Amino acid sequence: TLPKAEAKELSAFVQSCVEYKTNVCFTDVAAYESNQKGVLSSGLAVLVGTHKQLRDPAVQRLPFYNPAVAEAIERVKEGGTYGVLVEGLANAAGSKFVRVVVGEVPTKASRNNCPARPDVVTALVTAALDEVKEPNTTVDVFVLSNAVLPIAAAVARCGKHNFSAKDGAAAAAYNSGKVSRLQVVFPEPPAIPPKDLEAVATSTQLCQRLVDAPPNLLTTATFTEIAQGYAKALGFDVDVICGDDLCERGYGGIYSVGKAAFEAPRLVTLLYTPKGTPVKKVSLVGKGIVYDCGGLALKPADYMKLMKHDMGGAAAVFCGFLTAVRLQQPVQLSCTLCLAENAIGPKSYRNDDIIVMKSGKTVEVINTDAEGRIVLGDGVFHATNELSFTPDVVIDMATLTGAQGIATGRHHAGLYVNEEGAEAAMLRAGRESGETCFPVLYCPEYHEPEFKSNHADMTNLMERRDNAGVSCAGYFITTHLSPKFTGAHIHVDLAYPVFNSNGATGFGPALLTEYFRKL
Amino acid sequence: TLPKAEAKELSAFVQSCVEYKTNVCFTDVAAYESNQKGVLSSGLAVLVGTHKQLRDPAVQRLPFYNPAVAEAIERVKEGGTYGVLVEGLANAAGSKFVRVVVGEVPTKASRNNCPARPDVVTALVTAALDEVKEPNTTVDVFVLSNAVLPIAAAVARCGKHNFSAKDGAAAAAYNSGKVSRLQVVFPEPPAIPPKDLEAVATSTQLCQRLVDAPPNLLTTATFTEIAQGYAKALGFDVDVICGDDLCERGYGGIYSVGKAAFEAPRLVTLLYTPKGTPVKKVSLVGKGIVYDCGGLALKPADYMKLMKHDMGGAAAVFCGFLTAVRLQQPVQLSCTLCLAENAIGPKSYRNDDIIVMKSGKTVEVINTDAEGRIVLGDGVFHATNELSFTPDVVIDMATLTGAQGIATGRHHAGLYVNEEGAEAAMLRAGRESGETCFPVLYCPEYHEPEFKSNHADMTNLMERRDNAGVSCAGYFITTHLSPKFTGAHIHVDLAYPVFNSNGATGFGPALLTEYFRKL
Amino acid sequence: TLPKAEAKELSAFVQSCVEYKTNVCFTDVAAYESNQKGVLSSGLAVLVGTHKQLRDPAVQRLPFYNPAVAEAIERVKEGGTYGVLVEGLANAAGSKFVRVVVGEVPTKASRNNCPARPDVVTALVTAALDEVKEPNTTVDVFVLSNAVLPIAAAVARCGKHNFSAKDGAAAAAYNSGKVSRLQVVFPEPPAIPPKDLEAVATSTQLCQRLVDAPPNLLTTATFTEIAQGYAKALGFDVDVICGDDLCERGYGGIYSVGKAAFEAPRLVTLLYTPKGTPVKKVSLVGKGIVYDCGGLALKPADYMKLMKHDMGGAAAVFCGFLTAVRLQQPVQLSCTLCLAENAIGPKSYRNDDIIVMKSGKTVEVINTDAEGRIVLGDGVFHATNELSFTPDVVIDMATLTGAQGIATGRHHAGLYVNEEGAEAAMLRAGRESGETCFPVLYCPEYHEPEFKSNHADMTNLMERRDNAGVSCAGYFITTHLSPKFTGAHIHVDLAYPVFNSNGATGFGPALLTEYFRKL
Ligand SMILES: [Mn+2]
Ligand SMILES: [Mn+2]
Ligand SMILES: [Mn+2]
Ligand SMILES: [Mn+2]
Ligand SMILES: [Mn+2]
Ligand SMILES: [Mn+2]
């Protein structure tokens, strides 16, 4: 029983997520010339490209181009921006001066990176949008690259976040009033239709919204309601196993992790079957730890900050699923959300407790703060044993370990994969999408001894933390795969790539979309 | 209200403890020759003794002896084992080869140790049993020592533990399927009858079971039910003061420690009066902290692991009591179990709270993780004030302090004792039983000032941690002894001796049995 | 000025390393039958192979085979050993019984591992050699695998270490008296000649010796003298830049790191040019931190233990170089040893000091315990700018980061490589040699910003430690490569693979040999 005022706030927040619509739309130079007739949308325009692209003669045909803009192109630093005023340029806001911000994108890109460097595109547009005068304007963003998918996601990510509690926004269901409408103008008609690019951008931003949201708003219950709302609207199936039913049905892992919390844990499975014959059957599984306090293995306060992001894997997987449904991608999908709060209290699972997992394997809990692998263990067994089909590929996505950052860094999700082919394909999808990945060691024979237990089948924590920490957490999860499953298993550790110093990045959904696209 | 599946599991676990039967039986060479006619029980035999004992001519008359075994005796290292195959040796398993494992026991033994070195006996047999081929076999263990009590307990302790959650054992009420039946074969008919040695072994192993068990299985409630089950079966009295009744009846110490937990605290008192006139009246009191998270003074995770062992003193005292009832030892006994979980939550007793103990004395709580001395304070007052008799001797056993390990180590329980005579006797009982002890400083005049309080009669924590930390915890407990009590008080700190790297040792019950035997 | 007794001890230790000869020799079953005529070398024989290999009919033709050995094969556990006595088997020691120890090697091997699992081979032979009765015996080790290179190195690694200070060995220049001579018997004549396998084994063991040795013995001076000794004996060139001359010649990195120490730092370069036509040119550079106390950024004692291993990269590179010279491999080599002790005192380089590197680039020292990347920076610039040739490939090997263990674990060295091709080749060499490697993220555009400095060209420490810690250290080193260099750069982080719980592994030399072999 919550207070009435808190429950109304939660319902309104749910609705804000279910009805979320993007601020971004897409077009091309010829279509823009034709529809707008050389009238800018507002008093701000943005021009982004490489050193070489910015000097293409076609740039001179752009409606805002003049000798000041030419000088901006000369003075702008690589990775930086440079702004100039253009007097008496026609625009729909009737502004006397138009501000034109040029941004230079590097060409330097390692073999493990996206050649189009959408990371810099995001930062350039963000910086340029900080020069916005008025609210509710439309900003024309002219991009010289034709790498449409990575640019779409990059721009969706950029600028002020749709989630906000600033300046009375709490009374408007935490919908920001500071976001500018963005018109992305490609050089050529995009290889991917504009409406499809919109769906991608929408999923990136929704993912961002879910991750940014504080846990007083995004709970196990509200996340579930959001999933149910999208199921009603788009017509996909939803199965929910809630609270004590998890225990009764043998889901000891997710039950034990989540049982101390105010809001009960939930295993939420979503099903989508395309019209006609599917190219693959794929089961998605996401770590939905709505808040990771550590449990009895309580985190210090420094480390507990930003643990609202611990559901970033569930958000990624959920929004990737939504994109697939909206674009009618020809993949049969399950999406299992492992929703729990890792809370501290009298019902807390303990450091010493022995858990009977859904898989039938027993787990000695060494450290309650290694909760993610436990909920995922139940998730992947569910996906591989309990559904109406057996998947060809299982993809689990999780903000799983600190080791991930040390290993592969802030921009590359770690991949632990049982097959070379599935790994290469996910890497390729990362490089095409801009949501980059990198492999971690796959060597089960060396991971297995780290989990030896006196009394149970396994522990939940490596004996020696300095023995491939990203990999070992992946290994743990694989021990709970059903024997019925003989296909590819892709573990994605996205602990760090889901956020930066401005908040959530919406990393994961576009990665999935691109992966599905190439199956 | 627990889930139905969890409650069924708890009942089954209770029953497994109440009906626990040992895997060990005892006999002697002549009786073995006569009953088995030179046919080994299985494809494994074990031979354990000192360098000199192994070279006794009587060893050559053992049914598995041959020149390869003789060579094993030559090659085996002190404290080590050495295995050989014997071809065409008659055995009940019909194995073509019998494996004979020889183990050499040192003679070196300090004045504070058991001369028969049962510590090494345990490790030798454990190592030998790791060479077991099949399940459910009987292994003949030939021991060359006649120190029957320490060997009985040593062998009961050894090998795989009766508690297990491995390989589906959770569905069999956590009864291990990996334990071998062990036939211990002494050189001479044992000075203590085989059926009596069985009862001792049973108590060692039950104690081990209770200590090994994770706190999701062994709770304040299930521990109580187990005690009640044994009371029905053996016909001894049981008194239970439960939850809020502890507060109403003035038991502020145990109530305050346990009140935050999911399962309520309990003061459980068991009574046994022998048929004859008793040699002594003895009150046992045991720290039954089912799990020590530290309370609001929360333990870090490294330190919180194995805190399921924090009820080792209650297990020891409980199983020593059982043995006394089963063997009808002529001692009048009370056994008070101080059962609580030291949990963290909104009802947690605080660092600053002032407790009114049953004794009438007030305790200022400096640190909630010094919970044991508090529950014991109520326990010993109960024993010395509230029973139908006044004891001559109070023995409290507790996994009480980290200082214990630093002071007396992993194999020797620390003794804090108000009389030289009772101390010497408990030391002698430790040396005879193998469950060795060592004294800590008894000096109340120096302990007393460490507990000075501004507002209460005393604190629960020493001001200066480096001033006889085993002793000061003992001192605290003695301040709550009833003034009606004028007898011997033996405080046994067994923090480390109750476990090793394989889990529980079942340390304590045999110590008590031997102590009672010599009264 | 050292005491006379210490100087004599150091000279003798130097000589022990310079004259080091292996305990291992290699042959095959037919050559063994022919030379030894079915007579075992001693009272111990070892049989090692997979479950399938151990049941090959050819096993029955081995001279020690009998029904007891057959039973051993049945009873042995995967990854374990099992020993039996064989009566009246002919052997050179005239022993009445021969002990035969069987060891089972797993077939399970991930795509990132050596299929022959030499890691288990090492452990099996180690465990078998623990059953050795007498000193100075020869032990026949029958291996059922034909993977000769990885087995050679595996057996060289195994058992008791040639470095010892036990039982008066200090008086014998720390040459162990506990090492058994080992005769490795392959099924077929080895694809690599026995004398070549010996040279490999010798380098593995010498490497192990240098790493095991305490820093009171292996100093910057003695390591130098050892290199000089090998140069005189084998006829290769040696260049030494010592102490203050490092400062005068602009080697500010290695000079600053090492200048606080009792023994001066040294840049030691070795040159080998093969007879004839010109071939691949490779420059090796090794981190030779004889002891890493942390400098002014002092390590706690727990972390400072085993920092004698911090010269493992210099040892690896040195011994790989020796193997190339002994086998006359057709590669032109330089080998630069970056020798320093990272010591604490009044001359200590500081957290704030600004270093002028040999490369001309300035380094702001944030943390003196990140010393390795600094000495290596001077090393690689030396190799790529100061030699009589320019290398095609630079390989640096270093026990560089804690992040390495977290990322790629205890058995896999981390690879940071500027070219896909060179990376793949080093990986292949790891899988063939058994000295396995795994890549870490190569993404200089993301590493570069971590080293931004206010006043110098760069810092020596990442601003954010959780942003690809293995990779960033590698990146730092690459900033000091000469602009004259346009080839492949392979950075090998072997922090953890150079040791296990028994001490040094001798990891690195064989990896190099195999890499050179395939060029
Ligand atoms: Mn988490
Ligand atoms: Mn956690
Ligand atoms: Mn305690
Ligand atoms: Mn405590
Ligand atoms: Mn170092
Ligand atoms: Mn260092």
Residue numbers in the entry:
A (entry chain D), B (entry chain B), C (entry chain K): 3 to 521
Report text from the authors:
Leucine aminopeptidase (LAP) is found in all kingdoms of life and catalyzes the metal-dependent hydrolysis of the N-terminal amino acid residue of peptide or amino acyl substrates. LAPs of the M17 family of aminopeptidases are bilobal proteins with a highly conserved C-terminal domain harboring the aminopeptidase activity.
The holo TbLAP-A (crystallized in the presence of leucine), TbLAP-A complexes, and LmLAP-A structures have two metals bound in the active site; the TcLAP-A structures, in contrast, clearly show only one metal ion in site 1 and no metal in site 2. In TbLAP-A, the carboxylate oxygen atoms of D294 and E373 and the main-chain and carboxylate oxygens of D371 coordinate the metal ion in site 1 and the carboxylate oxygens of D294, E373, and D312 and the ε-amino group of K289 coordinate that in site 2. Most LAP-A crystals were grown in the presence of manganese ions. As LAPs are reported to be zinc-dependent enzymes, crystals of EDTA-treated TbLAP-A were grown in the presence of ZnCl2. Nevertheless, X-ray fluorescence (XRF) scans of the resulting crystals indicated the presence of manganese ions, suggesting that EDTA may not to be able to efficiently chelate the Mn2+ ions at the concentrations used. A second data set was collected from the same crystal at a wavelength of 1.3052 Å, between the absorption edges of manganese and zinc, and an anomalous difference Fourier synthesis was calculated for the data sets at both wavelengths by using phases from the refined model. The map for the 1.3052-Å wavelength data showed peaks at around 10 σ for both metal sites, substantially larger than the 7 σ peaks for the original data recorded with a wavelength of 0.97949 Å, clearly indicating that neither site was occupied by zinc. The metals were therefore modeled as manganese ions.
